[PDB]
């Protein structure tokens, strides 16, 4: 894939959402399938014991 990008066949893109498919997300006027994208966070511990 990295070889293809150098040749210009594939180029990275970052686009927005069309203002007609963005206003109606998860319901509203007769929409059927358009879930939002969400986030979150996890938090975990780490133990340690001494020796002699």
């Amino acid at each position: 894939i990295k070889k293809q990008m150098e040749a210009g066949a594939l180029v990275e893109i970052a686009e927005g959402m069309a203002t007609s498919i963005a206003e109606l997300q998860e319901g509203f006027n007769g929409s059927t399938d358009n879930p939002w994208n969400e986030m979150g966070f996890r938090i975990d511990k780490q133990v340690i014991e001494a020796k002699s």
């Binding site: 206003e23 109606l24 997300q25 998860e26 319901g27 509203f28």
Partner: protein, 52 residues
């Protein structure tokens, strides 16, 4: 002298209607009893946050 006239905006062909209405409210021929006036309601579905 006697009669009171009200114009029918959305009249069909040419009709004129005569009717009676006594001073006492009970002498009407048809009763229009309102129970509760317009009760406003507002909300927002969390699936899309769009006001309703």
């Amino acid at each position: 002298g006697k009669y009171r006239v009200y114009i029918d905006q959305y009249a069909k062909q040419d009709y004129f209607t005569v009717g009676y209405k006594g001073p006492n409210e009970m002498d009407a021929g048809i009763y229009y009893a309102p129970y509760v006036a317009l009760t406003p309601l507002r909300g927002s579905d969390p699936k899309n946050f769009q006001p309703v």
